[PDB]
Amino acid sequence: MLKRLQVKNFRCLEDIDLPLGPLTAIVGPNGAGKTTILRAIDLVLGDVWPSLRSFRIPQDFINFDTTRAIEITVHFDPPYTQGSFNITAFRLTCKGEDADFHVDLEPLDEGGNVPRYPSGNPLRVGTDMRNHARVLFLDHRRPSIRGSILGRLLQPVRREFKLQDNFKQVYEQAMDLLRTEQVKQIEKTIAETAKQMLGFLGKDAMKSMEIGFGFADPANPFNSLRLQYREDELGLGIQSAIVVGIFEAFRQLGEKIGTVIIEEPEMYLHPQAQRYFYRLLCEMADKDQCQIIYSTHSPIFADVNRFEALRLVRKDRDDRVVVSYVREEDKSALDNVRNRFKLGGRFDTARNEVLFAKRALLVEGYGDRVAALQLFNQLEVDPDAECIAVVDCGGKAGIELIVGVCKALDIPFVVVHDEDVWPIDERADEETRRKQEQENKAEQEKNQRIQACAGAERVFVVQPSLEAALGIGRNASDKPYRIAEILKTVDVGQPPDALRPFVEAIRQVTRP
Template sequence: MKLREVGAKCFRTLEDLTVEFGYDFCTLSGRNNAGKTAVVTIIRHFLDDEDRPYLYGENSLSFSRDHTQWSSSDEMEISVRLELHRHDDAEVFFVVDKFAPTPIEGEIARVRLTETFYKSGERQLACRVNGTDLDSQNSSEIAKKLKSASNLVVHNSTSPNRRIYYLSGEMTEVLESHFSQEDRNKIADAERNLSSKVKNAAKQHKEELSQLLGRLGENYEVELTTLERSGSSRFPLNVKLNDKSVDTNLGGWGSGTQNRTRVLISVLEADRIRKSQSSESRSTPIVIVEEPESFLHPSAQAEFGKVLNNLSADFGIQILTTTHSPYMLNQTSPEANLLLERKVTRSKLKETERVDTSGDDWMLPFAANLGVVSDEFIPWKKIVGSANSKIVLVEGAIDVEYFNILRDKFPEIYALPADVEVVGYGGKDALKNTQVLQFMLSRLEKVYITFDLDAEHEVTTKLRSIGLEVDKHFCSIGIDKPGRECIEGLLPEAILRDVYAQRVDDVLALGSANSSAKKSAKSNLKQAALERFRNCSLNSADIPEMARLIKKIARAF
């Protein structure tokens, strides 16, 4: 099942809002009280089982409690739009097909549920399947099935569902683990051997959880032990995490490790629900994780954000996170990051609006969560969208072209690994915002930064301030001679003489007081030098300075 849209009219701060979820890993950002919780509440209202109320019954909505305070409307409306797959969501798909006016053709059923709450206290539910409205009774049957079919797994990092047992003289935290119907039937048939049966059923769960934890790059082992249960179809398990020197219950670990482990258990539960059902009763839940960055250092947030993104793709499960962290955003598909903010009218916060994050505004959620001006992200768009984790950062597009020419024409000296990408960052000023730079570096496995020699003093100070070391992490490019303090300065003198001789007007314009003319002349000379290098006949012995640069960068990788 995939969530594609949440809508609301006069619901809390959502006076008139539609939010679309077009990706498998989506994030929802915004300041406190921006409306994120309201969106999650709507999703839970339609998909969470009413037999498992959360937050002491807050999932029971009403006009009197949830109607937008400043609105005079007598109605409140909430809706969700879902996509069901005939195979992956067979259990619900069967019911929808049964109650739809006409048989569903194809593999996808598009279901929209809308509930209207009236000031009088009445409420009305409506359902539309593939564009066709259903009557109230059939709508109700589909809504009931969506709630009861394990279609939603929720983890709130700020107030996790924790159960504490007092066992063997100590307080033990217990996490509930979902088992398949087949496992449950076996356990029911052999109640007197419950403990051993649960241990057998838990074996695969332990292995899968260990594999997920292994994605974090830390050496955890998982130990699961069973506890007495009280007739539930879920079985309490005591969780221990072990590394080379420590063996302790989950509750004894740091808050960040505890939170990541609980989040991964929630994702694993969704995957097991999807896999463990028979073909006719299969369900693929949606996973909601609220504030997964809780208690985590920024470097751990960056790592964990990648893990959740990858798990969503690997498991084929939609994961929606609410977050205040730029590190938890979807960095492979920035348009999947949704940003909410409150409109201000006469100095008072009013309705929630969705900020446009399409096109060139992709950086707004990153900037909002990092607390910087959005324009600071513009030079880094190529890096955010890159699938590569090993990158050489160069000043601009011309520098990228030099590296491409060296790779294609001089493979004998181009020693950079094949999986290293060369990306331009748009000039030295981009390196001066160390807050944004650190965020960019955090999402990559290895980065080497280059910049023109004439910017060495101001750039080196900034890079050293965030712990980077010369030659190991960065270097300047150029020769310490006037006009050669850049990548063109590494070219043979014969090429430079030819270019300058052919473009005398541009050379003279370099001394102009007109900054625009000076900038244009410099650009023309740089482009001419690049084309001359691209088309001339040279061998590697003719470009020793280029060879030394490549060798230095290659050593860093």
């Protein structure tokens, strides 16, 4: 599998370095580098040998510069053994001094050096070596489909095939029904003309070449097989559905298929089908049957609970592309937080919207979101137009989790939550007093952990709780019409003292 990508001076990617894992989910705004990361991988490892014909000069250089060298380095594991060399990466360079540019594909060892022979010449990247690490690229290709993707599916079929001779005779029999006299004269005009054009190259005989009409190589028929259907946004959805079916056949066939890159796996799938596809891709990645690298705009394919997969790509104040992800050092602390949330917590795909927003307001629960959005409306802010995600995190442990992801990804955020500490009723019985004390301490610990990960300047605490600030019963705590009519009597100008941290949280997350 691919392990790491380095890109220098390629289109919008001035300098970038990101890890790659069994599932790599790449998110970020349009034009901010997302697709260019994928194209850089395809340049080195796609099915066209990297050469000067692979680049647009100067289109592919930063600023159309060309005094800078394009450099794409792809690292992988396990190493490729060539004789006495173990190669762990390829480095594709395109540079030049005007006006002769050139590209090199160099092999690199564990230590980042190009091995050389005792003769002193460097080791060059050969066919077997590059095909070692080749990737399937599913870009938006989506009444028929075909590609190296289906080809890889049929390669166990193409193997045990044993009726090649019979197929040739039936195939030719069918081609003869097509070869009208006019068809043959059209074919002869094409083939004779092409051969004359080729003759100018001087390479002869060359007269061994057959050029004609047909719809398959009868020797290797499974190389022209496609999926087809009878009968366009409808057509596009059908072709997306057939792709899901192809991947479902892979999973049942169990064969390892290596590295697949997908531009927007969601496209033209119903959300329910996107859920089915994502679950399928995750099973194959986790089972170690392939590696999936993709760009996505869908919160169904960008799961906050799988935070190791996340790469967030965007341009900084200076139009410099920057990639964010959970650092290795930090994975274990966030994983602990993910586990604490899984005890009693429930997962919610809607929370993944945090990954697509300019800014996030993190709240505990459904009632808090309803109240937040009504206050937005009273402050005359539309959170959808401002790309502010208001995220129901599923309680305090859930907030910790989303905070840790936002912190690791450099997503700006504000937290609001209740204090949930209550004075002890000195008249209650021993068990109630003791349990109140213990609950207060537990809540204080949860409040302190949120403060430690978010920072205090990003956290607003409603004392003792939003329910108490609103005067709202326990029954009605989540009824939107009840929350709305209470909040409609409040004055955003001077929100009550109890309610003040809630509306100030919304003012902070709104502040440009």
